[PDB]
Structure 1
Amino acid sequence: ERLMMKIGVFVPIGNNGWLISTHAPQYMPTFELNKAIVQKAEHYHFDFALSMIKLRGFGGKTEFWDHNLESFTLMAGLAAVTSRIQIYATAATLTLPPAIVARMAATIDSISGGRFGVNLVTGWQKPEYEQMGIWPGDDYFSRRYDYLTEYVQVLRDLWGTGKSDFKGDFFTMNDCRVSPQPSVPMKVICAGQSDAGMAFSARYADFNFCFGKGVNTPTAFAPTAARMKQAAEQTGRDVGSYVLFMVIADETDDAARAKWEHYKAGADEEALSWLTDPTSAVNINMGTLVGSYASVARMLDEVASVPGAEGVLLTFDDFLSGIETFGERIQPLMQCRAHLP
């Protein structure tokens, strides 16, 4: 019952991170920026770094997510300039054959010395795929986890034995070979929120990402983590929840709130239209923690007490300064991080 929680950083592979506002920091996703971010996160003992994959943006004044790097190649570069932090890339399974993902994962396993894992996603936004002629049709919405189930069986064969003879509705392996196999058991993580998605995660994932909920209501996601725990019961597997939040912290509650309101007041409404104390569309209605460093520490400790919650995935309004103030001012106050040096 002693508080212990893992901390990850959701790295800005897309421009402007997760704020859709002309008052938010404006920046392009460069390798050097993400290198600075992940090296600083590693310095402050963040447990992992994850990048999403986003194949189409939302336009507007800030050209929001119009500029995005590719996840496996970004994480391969970050693996080469880190030494301790876990590194996860996202595979949009419609865009990469499973044997290619299998070999890419083995490659970054080699780059990182065993620190690499894969976030498997089905894809949900039809424009990302229709734009390049690979959308399977609106049958995909209901069948996508059948597809993902075949996909991961191929991956598990290849990582586990170096070969696959899997034959299904979507893939045909005829003694497919991928070697080297990963030096350590390959980590698979998933971000399913639906019943079907959580059932997939319960069978195949090491843990499951879910959305934090509300502004300064850190435990509001609890029913989602409860559903994941029950999905995991149905496989007997230990598959905890990692919860996505944005942290907007400052010296005082008032100063942090002033920033949050300043961001909301610059909302890039044209971009928000394309994408279409309450949450705000300015950060895609993300669960948000806004307060003094001590207030954010207290609220993150609350997250750690939720049944099934094993970690948080953090975005910030400003990653370079936000990681620094998290490491210097927030994390030392967190009971659930007392295990760190």
Structure 2
Amino acid sequence: MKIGVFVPIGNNGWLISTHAPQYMPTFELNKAIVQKAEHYHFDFALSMIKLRGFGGKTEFWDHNLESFTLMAGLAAVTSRIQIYATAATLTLPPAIVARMAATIDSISGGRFGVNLVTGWQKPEYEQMGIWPGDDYFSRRYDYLTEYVQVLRDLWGTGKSDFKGDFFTMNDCRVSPQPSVPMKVICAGQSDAGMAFSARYADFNFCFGKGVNTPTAFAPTAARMKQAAEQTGRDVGSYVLFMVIADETDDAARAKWEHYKAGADEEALSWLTPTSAVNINMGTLVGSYASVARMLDEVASVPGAEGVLLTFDDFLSGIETFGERIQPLMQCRAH
């Protein structure tokens, strides 16, 4: 099973709590995170993009770096881990993304990939008046499809003449071309989404579900595996969890309750037994060995190729995972 880290590109990571570690997303923090991750043989790092926050006492995700520049910087200070940036396709022309990815390919030596995102919240895009109306809700995938087609032309051959409803290319050039085949990623959960993933993505990101119910996401992995049958393409699931670990189950449970107790509820309304303190993320709470066991249970779901991990505390989380969780995991004995 592959393991990656979901790097905090917004403040306070994935906890909306006054009891959660409070920190700003800085390059040097992310640098320290990816370098630790690389040290413990994590396979990849991924940064979302978030163009607007949810306010509140903690000002959750009001401070957010830009993904392609953050990963170009992380690329220049790592050597082995895989680096994925997220392009919000409404805000960047495909030809630019294409060139940006060639560029981070050059920095990283073939370690870069791109995570293509529709955009879901209207506020992110209306705020800068580029949201294309409510037609987009059920037509993003038609848009995304033309988009990916321009990228493939440019990475593939270095030119594109694509003519569709949304883009017009007239001998568009982009060289150099990526030194390796350019990995693309998607995180659609809908039928459209999976359909897209199966055609063009190299793996699909889905959400873990429940506290301490590791294999609860299995349906969606099964659905993603079904959608992949329809294109004959090997397109695995990579599931997002928050790990809250400790030396014992009681200890870890105590951290978890502590976080949920300090919920920033003003910030939680703007968004609107799992807790919304991590946006109802799938969470594994327990001792190092409890958590190792549950991840072993994740590696055994059909479709599951890897997990994408957040922590309550990234620097110690990545360390405890490296030192105490990983080496008890069957699925990581290589």
Question: Shared fold (TM-score greater than 0.5)?
Answer: yes
User: Post-superposition shift, 1:325?
Assistant: 0.1
User: Post-superposition shift, 1:38?
Assistant: 0.2
User: Post-superposition shift, 1:288?
Assistant: 0.1
The separation in 2 between residues aligned to 1:312 and 1:226, in whole angstroms, is: 16
SS of equivalent residue, structure 2 residue 270: helix
- Post-superposition CA distance 1:200-222 (Å, at most 9, x none): 00000000000000000000000
User: Post-superposition shift, 1:186?
Assistant: 0.2
User: Post-superposition shift, 1:135?
Assistant: 0.3
The separation in 2 between residues aligned to 1:255 and 1:275, in whole angstroms, is: 30
User: Post-superposition shift, 1:295?
Assistant: 0.1
- Post-superposition CA distance 1:174-222 (Å, at most 9, x none): 0000000000000000001000000000000000000000000000000
The separation in 1 between residues aligned to 2:201 and 2:60, in whole angstroms, is: 30
User: Post-superposition shift, 1:89?
Assistant: 0.1
Q: Percent identity?
A: 100
User: Post-superposition shift, 1:146?
Assistant: 0.2
SS of equivalent residue, structure 2 residue 142: helix
User: Post-superposition shift, 1:46?
Assistant: 0.1
User: Post-superposition shift, 1:172?
Assistant: 0.2
- Post-superposition CA distance 1:101-122 (Å, at most 9, x none): 0000000000000000000010
SS of equivalent residue, structure 1 residue 142: coil
The separation in 2 between residues aligned to 1:244 and 1:202, in whole angstroms, is: 19
The separation in 2 between residues aligned to 1:173 and 1:250, in whole angstroms, is: 54
- Post-superposition CA distance 1:209-240 (Å, at most 9, x none): 00000000000000000000000000000000
The separation in 1 between residues aligned to 2:83 and 2:233, in whole angstroms, is: 23
The separation in 1 between residues aligned to 2:167 and 2:24, in whole angstroms, is: 37
Among residues 34, 40, 47, which one is paired with 2:36 in the alignment? 40
- Post-superposition CA distance 1:255-307 (Å, at most 9, x none): 0000000000000000001111x000000000000000000000000000000
Matched, 1:133 2:134: no
User: Post-superposition shift, 1:124?
Assistant: 0.4
The separation in 1 between residues aligned to 2:165 and 2:120, in whole angstroms, is: 20
The separation in 1 between residues aligned to 2:135 and 2:251, in whole angstroms, is: 48
The separation in 1 between residues aligned to 2:109 and 2:234, in whole angstroms, is: 25
The separation in 2 between residues aligned to 1:139 and 1:70, in whole angstroms, is: 27
- Post-superposition CA distance 1:117-171 (Å, at most 9, x none): 0000100000000000000000000000000000000000000000000000000
SS of equivalent residue, structure 1 residue 139: helix
User: Post-superposition shift, 1:310?
Assistant: 0.2
The separation in 2 between residues aligned to 1:263 and 1:320, in whole angstroms, is: 17
Matched, 1:263 2:262: no
User: Post-superposition shift, 1:13?
Assistant: 0.3
SS of equivalent residue, structure 1 residue 39: helix
2:109 equivalent in structure 1: 113
Relative to the length of structure 2, the TM-score reads 1.00
How many residues end up aligned between the 2 structures?
334
The separation in 2 between residues aligned to 1:267 and 1:168, in whole angstroms, is: 47
1:249 equivalent in structure 2: 245
SS of equivalent residue, structure 2 residue 214: coil
The separation in 1 between residues aligned to 2:296 and 2:173, in whole angstroms, is: 45
SS of equivalent residue, structure 2 residue 154: helix
- Post-superposition CA distance 1:24-64 (Å, at most 9, x none): 00000000000000000000000000000000000000000
The separation in 1 between residues aligned to 2:188 and 2:226, in whole angstroms, is: 14
SS of equivalent residue, structure 1 residue 330: helix
SS of equivalent residue, structure 1 residue 246: strand
The separation in 1 between residues aligned to 2:166 and 2:253, in whole angstroms, is: 49
The separation in 2 between residues aligned to 1:338 and 1:24, in whole angstroms, is: 32
User: Post-superposition shift, 1:308?
Assistant: 0.4
Matched, 1:165 2:161: yes
The separation in 2 between residues aligned to 1:261 and 1:216, in whole angstroms, is: 14
The separation in 2 between residues aligned to 1:113 and 1:238, in whole angstroms, is: 24
SS of equivalent residue, structure 2 residue 87: strand
User: Post-superposition shift, 1:317?
Assistant: 0.3
1:26 equivalent in structure 2: 22
The separation in 2 between residues aligned to 1:121 and 1:275, in whole angstroms, is: 19
- Post-superposition CA distance 1:69-100 (Å, at most 9, x none): 00000000000000000000000000000000
Relative to the length of structure 1, the TM-score reads 0.98
SS of equivalent residue, structure 2 residue 310: strand
The separation in 2 between residues aligned to 1:237 and 1:78, in whole angstroms, is: 30
Matched, 1:290 2:285: yes
Q: Mind listing any 5+ residue stretches in structure 2 that lack a counterpart? A: none
SS of equivalent residue, structure 2 residue 137: helix
User: Post-superposition shift, 1:15?
Assistant: 0.2
Matched, 1:89 2:85: yes
The separation in 2 between residues aligned to 1:95 and 1:330, in whole angstroms, is: 39
SS of equivalent residue, structure 2 residue 139: helix
